[PDB]
Amino acid sequence: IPRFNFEKFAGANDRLTTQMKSVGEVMAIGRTQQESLQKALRGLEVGATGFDPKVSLDDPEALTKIRRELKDAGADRIWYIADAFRAGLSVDGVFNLTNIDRWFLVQIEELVRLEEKVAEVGITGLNADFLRQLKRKGFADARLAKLAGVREAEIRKLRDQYDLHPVYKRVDTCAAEFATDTAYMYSTYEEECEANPSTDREKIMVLGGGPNRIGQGIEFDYCCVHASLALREDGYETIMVNCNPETVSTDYDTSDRLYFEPVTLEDVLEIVRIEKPKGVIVQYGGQTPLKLARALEAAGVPVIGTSPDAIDRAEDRERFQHAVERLKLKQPANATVTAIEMAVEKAKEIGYPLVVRP
Amino acid sequence: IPRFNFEKFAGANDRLTTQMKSVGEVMAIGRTQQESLQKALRGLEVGATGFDPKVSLDDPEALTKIRRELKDAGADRIWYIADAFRAGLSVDGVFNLTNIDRWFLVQIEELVRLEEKVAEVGITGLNADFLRQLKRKGFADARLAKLAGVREAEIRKLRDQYDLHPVYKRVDTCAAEFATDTAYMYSTYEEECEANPSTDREKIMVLGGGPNRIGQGIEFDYCCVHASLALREDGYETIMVNCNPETVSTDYDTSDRLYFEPVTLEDVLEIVRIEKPKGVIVQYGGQTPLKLARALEAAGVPVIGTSPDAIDRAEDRERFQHAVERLKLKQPANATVTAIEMAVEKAKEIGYPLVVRP
Amino acid sequence: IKSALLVLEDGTQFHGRAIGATGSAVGEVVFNTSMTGYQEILTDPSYSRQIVTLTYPHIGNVGTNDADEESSQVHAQGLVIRDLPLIASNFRNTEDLSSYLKRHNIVAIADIDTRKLTRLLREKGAQNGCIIAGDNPDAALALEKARAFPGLNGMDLAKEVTTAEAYSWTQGSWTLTGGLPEAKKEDELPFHVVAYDFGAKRNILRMLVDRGCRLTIVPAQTSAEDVLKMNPDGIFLSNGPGDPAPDDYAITAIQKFLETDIPVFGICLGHQLLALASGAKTVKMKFGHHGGNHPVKDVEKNVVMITAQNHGFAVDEATLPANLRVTHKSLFDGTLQGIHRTDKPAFSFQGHPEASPGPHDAAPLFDHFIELIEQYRKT
Amino acid sequence: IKSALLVLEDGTQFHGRAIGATGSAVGEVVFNTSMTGYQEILTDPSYSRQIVTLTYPHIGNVGTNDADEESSQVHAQGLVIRDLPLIASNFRNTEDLSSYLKRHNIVAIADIDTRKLTRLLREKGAQNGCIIAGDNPDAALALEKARAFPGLNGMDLAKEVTTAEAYSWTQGSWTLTGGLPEAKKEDELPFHVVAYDFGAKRNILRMLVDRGCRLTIVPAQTSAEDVLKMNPDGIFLSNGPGDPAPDDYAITAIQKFLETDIPVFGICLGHQLLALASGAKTVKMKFGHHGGNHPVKDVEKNVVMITAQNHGFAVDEATLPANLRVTHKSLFDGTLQGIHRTDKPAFSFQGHPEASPGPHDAAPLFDHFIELIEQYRKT
Numbered sequence A, B: 001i002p003r004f005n006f007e008k009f010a011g012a013n014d015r016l017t018t019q020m021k022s023v024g025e026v027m028a029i030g031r032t033q034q035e036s037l038q039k040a041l042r043g044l045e046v047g048a049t050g051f052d053p054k055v056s057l058d059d060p061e062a063l064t065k066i067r068r069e070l071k072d073a074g075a076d077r078i079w080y081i082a083d084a085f086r087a088g089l090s091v092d093g094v095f096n097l098t099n100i101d102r103w104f105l106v107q108i109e110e111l112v113r114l115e116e117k118v119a120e121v122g123i124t125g126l127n128a129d130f131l132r133q134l135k136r137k138g139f140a141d142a143r144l145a146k147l148a149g150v151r152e153a154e155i156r157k158l159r160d161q162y163d164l165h166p167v168y169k170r171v172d173t174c175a176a177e178f179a180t181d182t183a184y185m186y187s188t189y190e191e192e193c194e195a196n197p198s199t200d201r202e203k204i205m206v207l208g209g210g211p212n213r214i215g216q217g218i219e220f221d222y223c224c225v226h227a228s229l230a231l232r233e234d235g236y237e238t239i240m241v242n243c244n245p246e247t248v249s250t251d252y253d254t255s256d257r258l259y260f261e262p263v264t265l266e267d268v269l270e271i272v273r274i275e276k277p278k279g280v281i282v283q284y285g286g287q288t289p290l291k292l293a294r295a296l297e298a299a300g301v302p303v304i305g306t307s308p309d310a311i312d313r314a315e316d317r318e319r320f321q322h323a324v325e326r327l328k329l330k331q332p333a334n335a336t337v338t339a340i341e342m343a344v345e346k347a348k349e350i351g352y353p354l355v356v357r358p
Numbered sequence C, D: 001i002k003s004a005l006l007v008l009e010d011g012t013q014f015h016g017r018a019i020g021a022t023g024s025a026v027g028e029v030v031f032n033t034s035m036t037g038y039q040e041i042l043t044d045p046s047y048s049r050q051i052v053t054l055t056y057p058h059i060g061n062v063g064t065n066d067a068d069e070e071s072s073q074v075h076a077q078g079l080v081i082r083d084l085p086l087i088a089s090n091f092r093n094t095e096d097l098s099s100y101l102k103r104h105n106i107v108a109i110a111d112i113d114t115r116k117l118t119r120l121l122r123e124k125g126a127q128n129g130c131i132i133a134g135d136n137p138d139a140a141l142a143l144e145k146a147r148a149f150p151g152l153n154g155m156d157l158a159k160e161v162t163t164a165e166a167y168s169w170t171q172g173s174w175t176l177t178g179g180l181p182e183a184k185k186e187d188e189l190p191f192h193v194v195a196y197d198f199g200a201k202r203n204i205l206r207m208l209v210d211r212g213c214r215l216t217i218v219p220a221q222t223s224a225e226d227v228l229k230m231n232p233d234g235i236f237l238s239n240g241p242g243d244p245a246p247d248d249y250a251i252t253a254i255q256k257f258l259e260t261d262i263p264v265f266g267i268c269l270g271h272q273l274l275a276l277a278s279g280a281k282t283v284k285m286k287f288g289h290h291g292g293n294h295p296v297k298d299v300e301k302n303v304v305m306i307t308a309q310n311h312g313f314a315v316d317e318a319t320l321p322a323n324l325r326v327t328h329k330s331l332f333d334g335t336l337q338g339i340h341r342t343d344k345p346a347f348s349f350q351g352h353p354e355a356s357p358g359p360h361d362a363a364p365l366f367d368h369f370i371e372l373i374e375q376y377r378k379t
């Protein structure tokens, strides 16, 4: 799936054409297209848990916006497609608009229907036979949870309960006709697990940033490789977690073990679960893994380097000012306005010119 | 199918509710639901020849209007249902908005898909087989014409060529379990015909006015009955053509032979074709029959009484003025303006106050 | 294109579409006027060897479901309709008509002028026919087949449909709410009825159970002796295909029961049998009575009931013994509809009191039988 | 819920869903890595008695069509897949995969860990198994059926698939543009080739005609004599299930052809035949070669071809008589692939030069053969 950055170019023509406009790309592996597709969506780093809705069901104008998005593709179409299904457009109607082979579309529709079940049944309807069905479809814990009106965590627990966990298969180029020694894996909801973690060594986990976007480029990927290359050299068992197909980090030669997966709390936890690494570095892949730091730790992840808390200290506007305050250092005047008339005053205080961050 | 007159009550809420707003209704009989519905649509006297579109295919905003018309039914809903299938909506989508049983929706949908093929193969693709299938689904020559991009007469020409005509079945209260001596019939595209016209008597055919509307009431029907009753008593074999279920005219006792059909050129010609009446009265059923007069005559029908052309003399503004003139009679000062500024001047001529007929 | 064709003895041809299995079907052609109830009609054992044409154009509107099965299988030889709907649309549906037919292997044809067909059977009386469904149906073959047909007219149908060994029935009627009930316990039913299976409809059994009867379903050839041996509360003679010969086993046993004081009740073929056993004669009707809107007058009370009918043969009222009094007659044609033995506690009805499908107006006939039973048990 | 289940000799279970016919299937289980060509694989005679497992997860994306049938019927025993697509989406499609499976009455199971399964075969070697599809599949029975299998090894399969009487083939290959051509007139084909149907693939015939060959297809057991009578331009030994035992008829026959100057060309099974008849031995492979990405080297030119493979047996390069040279070898495992008689105009390839499905890389094999016939004629 390609990654765009149209919100950084307001005045720009955001319709997809023959000239590329995307800034990066994400890749996923599944045992099925539906699985493959959803994993990719949730690894895109655009805040999607999958086929999250763009328009409201009770919007009298929604079919119109849906139609437009569908006929003249933008970066959001994939989503507008599921929305089409929610709104009652047929597979054929969607086809005439987008020209996307019905083979694909049908799959999307199926996903939209299951979703609806979900939403109808609530968390209660989440037996273990279904939940597992949902999981083999690539549904993410976070997706279901919105659907079921619960916390992602709840779904997470539930699974734990059912002992509902993915398995890991390997890449071998030959559909298992031969054996491999490489450890290039991906998750799926099948039977046999091929992870076969080592009990043997001290393992260090490196989290990547996923697909590139402006501000989260190759520079971060550079660091991540270096971490692996270094520690592996030092003798640790290095395990890379990333899903950006263009990089050096996702080259099986860069680490001992490679998990081509979405850099999500869910997918990460899963890997940890069986790897039980010594430590995990979340300070090298950019904003992606960094946002995951608190959560991971509370979830019991052995986060190494600057603590997640520490991190927050610096990021948090209030926590930072405070420490700046404490060391007795120079920082520009600031304020935290809530109302227009409020700022105008505070503004007088601080002094033009000003820097207005939202 | 109910008959409305909203256009006459501009500021009225035109949404359908528990309080009746209809002014009449038409009825049709068919060997199939499709056939029966289409026949009713073409006899409604609203200018419809079947499922004529209400919104355009290239209107970006269409789905929204359609959506609105399906969710909150007005008198036009039947046509917005087809428009919906044209535009990409599924039967399930339509169902959720309207609550019309899918048993019906699927049928309309199939009609639309058929229309699409028609439009596609054009007149050349109208072979005898296909044209027969269409007729069988209740398609009017006028509607096919429209899709084929020709005049109605051309569709009819084709039928004559293929010897594609309907048969007449009889109403018997028993599904043919017992025979009948009554002549209460309806057209259908089938095998056996039960019209069995007489060769015995001098026949007169009276055309009704279809469903009642404002200004086209029972009064006309009254006249229609009288003709039938009178000429019957006088020794003629009286044939009534009408499809208004509320009237005395469609009572089988009123006439010798009753054809419960759409009062259209297509319908009337088929009947004339086998009955070969001595004369046809077109002046008693109001506007519906009056409007057919010239075509009927032109196609060979023995219209009786005041002539089609005469009737035109009077109705036509110009022809009339001329006559009035010729008789040296008094007629309000008039003008036939084209533009804004033209009228203002002309008005000046004519004098206020003015009566502005479009 | 899925062609199908129907040809009559008389050579009449109807060209249409195949809606069920591939192949051919031959039998006596009948028309039924029932606007609803198609599944029930097709699964009625009285339609064995017959090719059923339905007058109501749209057939399959509501798909099908097990509760609407009147027996363990489709008995119609083939089905003839005007139109097969695009979809079945009913909360009860469990399978669309076409798949069902296929499933049951019935040859069926749609899209033919069923009104012309019906008018013809009415006018000229019943006729044999063959339907052929396939790539290129051969109308000469179909015609051959139809012409060759031996027909019903001196055929033992009932033996074909009857049960191999006797069995127990204690299940009651279906309800909207609960559907079809779990079968009752023996001790939950006060009366024991022995019912002769001549190709009996499930609804009759269910309705009897509804009234207190625990049933013992017996093969049509079952002897009066063996029966009496069971100590019956009443004897029931089921509905069934064809007609019985004066000749045959059953008439024999019946007469025996009639020597006894056990109450006997017959429906349709069962009524026939009762009249034959009582010394009355049966005739083959022009086209018969096949529908659900048939007016029957109870001559005794002077009242009219709308009834479900399914019969090609009828009891000669002229040939009626004196110990046989007329209880109902048709208001459509005046044909004999019900009788009662003056001398014995036995009565029968030509129609289908158990309906299914059809109006429930005739249900009370069942209650007279219960009365009868109750008295017998008193003495 | 349509339950399905597959069970292995070893007692390894695989639960799933039924996508084909109802019932059970038993046979040797194999895996084929071909991501395209599922129909052509199913209709391969060579798959007789075998249970097919496909590695590629989505099977049936393009539905089915006649032109993709390599034989008159579906020879594989059962079908094992990961996912059956909601729809088929291909302009060439004529019937969905499920529908077709049922039409061909095949017992098939989807939604199972085909990876697991594949790895198991790879590791442990080929295994017999049984699939059970139905309302409540029985594990043990399945297991029973699984172990009780006599199996391929020591089985005359060819006989099972070969044609009853002999026939003439003059049909060429398919074209996107034209599709399947009309069979050529016999006066249009310069050469006459006699081909032994051991369960021959159509494509093979098609490509020969394409090559100028008029074909006379003969039963397996046909004697060398009855043939030599036909005055062939060359003799061909088709592919086919199982493997020949040094014992059987064809061995004998072929040798006769080998005493002659008639050019002789064998494929797959026929490649083994030619070898056996030439003095070498065959061996059953661990798991075999089933896919379309198989490298094979033409040792003479030192060039590689990507080839279509379907063969559980192999010619022991070790046992080779001296009149038998090595032409090709498998780059995957170094097993023997091609051979040529140094003495005679005889050669055979282990892979399918005719592919279908798979790379046309090995096509030129045929040209050799023609090269031989031409020369033979010259003389």
Ligand SMILES: [Cl-]
Pocket (backbone or CB within 6 Å): A127, A129, A130
């Ligand atoms: Cl569930």
Ligand SMILES: [Cl-]
Pocket (backbone or CB within 6 Å): B011, B012, B013
């Ligand atoms: Cl109002």
Ligand SMILES: [Cl-]
Pocket (backbone or CB within 6 Å): B125, B127, B130
């Ligand atoms: Cl056509």
Ligand SMILES: [Cl-]
Pocket (backbone or CB within 6 Å): B191, C013, C014, C015, C111, C112, C113
């Ligand atoms: Cl017909």
Ligand SMILES: [Cl-]
Pocket (backbone or CB within 6 Å): A191, D013, D014, D015, D111, D112, D113, D114
């Ligand atoms: Cl499995």
Ligand SMILES: [Cl-]
Pocket (backbone or CB within 6 Å): D168, D169, D170, D171, D183
């Ligand atoms: Cl040929």
Ligand SMILES: [K+]
Pocket (backbone or CB within 6 Å): C015, C016, C111, C112, C113
């Ligand atoms: K027809």
Ligand SMILES: [K+]
Pocket (backbone or CB within 6 Å): D015, D016, D111, D112, D113
């Ligand atoms: K499974």
